[PDB]
Structure formats: C-alpha cells, structure tokens
C-alpha cells in the first residue's frame with residue numbers, strides 16, 4: 646500500500662508585555678500555530694484548521710483556511726487549545742491536536758511539539774495533492 650507522512654509542528658510562542666495591562670489585566674501576546682516541518686503550502690491538501698480557545702474568549706472557535714495557520718491573541722491565562730485539521734478529501738479523518746498554551750518559563754516563551762499526519766492508502770487525487 647501507500648503511506649504518506651506529513652510531519653508538522655504545533656504549539657505556541659509568547660511575549661510578556663513588560664507590565665500587566667491596567668484596562669484588561671492581559672500580560673502576554675501569544676500565537677498558537679500549526680506549520681509543516683519542511684516548507685510546503687499545506688492548503689494543497691488541508692481545507693481548514695480550527696483553533697478552539699477557552700470559552701471565556703469571544704468567538705472561541707477560530708478557523709484559518711490560508712497559511713500561515715495561526716491565531717494571535719492577548720491574555721493572562723494558560724489553558725488547552727484544541728487544534729483540528731480538516732482535509733480537502735472529506736473521507737480523510739480530521740487530525741485533532743491538544744496544546745497547553747504556555748505563557749511563562751527577555752527570551753521568547755516557546756512550547757512546540759512535533760507530530761505526523763499519516764495518510765494510509767489515500768485516493769489517487771489526494772495522493773497528487775499530498776505530493
């Protein structure tokens with residue numbers, strides 16, 4: 646059979662403001678993302694990536710369809726973000742990732758994980774799109 650492995654990295658970077666912010670108490674800017682391990686345009690084969698934030702955010706289900714696959718926000722809190730990757734072939738099961746937003750230990754805060762999206766015997770059309 647055919648196995649196509651698409652390596653990815655996901656997670657977040659964060660920047661401390663320098664001071665807590667009086668008007669909302671946010672302390673950090675952060676960006677949560679998915680990106681390919683090697684430079685490729687994932688929109689060849691990815692329909693959309695959903696980023697589900699803590700429900701205390703407005704419009705906590707954030708959707709990106711065009712790279713880069715990232716969401717930039719501010720806040721004070723750390724919580725899991727559910728990252729769901731949907732494919733152009735609706736018969737390819739979506740990939741669900743789970744990421745704990747990291748804001749704390751000058752140096753940019755980074756928490757980034759490697760993973761692999763495995764396509765076992767895709768349609769010939771989806772094969773072309775993955776290669």
Ligand SMILES: Cn1nnc2cc(CO)ccc21
Nearest residue numbers: 699701702719720721722723
């Ligand atoms: C959980 N958390 N952390 N920081 C937050 C900021 C907002 C929007 O002001 C909502 C929820 C937040």
